[PDB]
């Protein structure tokens, strides 16, 4: 019963490095390189995932 919680927590951890058909996994890297109107298509695609 501890194994299931610790496994599921590592499962949510690994999802932070998935794209969902995006170009990067760190929101500040998208904000540092492209104005917000030219970044909403990546941000909504990270948000839904």
């Amino acid at each position: 019963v501890v194994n299931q919680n610790a496994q599921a927590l590592n499962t949510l951890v690994k999802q932070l490095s998935s794209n969902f058909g995006a170009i990067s996994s760190v929101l500040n890297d998208i904000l540092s390189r492209l104005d917000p109107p030219e970044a909403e298509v990546q941000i909504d695609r990270l948000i839904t995932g």
Partner: protein
Amino acid sequence: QKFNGLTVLPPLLTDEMIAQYTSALLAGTITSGWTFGAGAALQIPFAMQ
């Protein structure tokens, strides 16, 4: 682990107070039999229990 916002709250009871309850429950069968959870405790030697 806390950087991504995974907070673990500690249980309401410690193991010392839980062990105080298990010690009361163990003492009640060795001293009063079964007539202490339905009423007020009543002594009785173990040879008749």
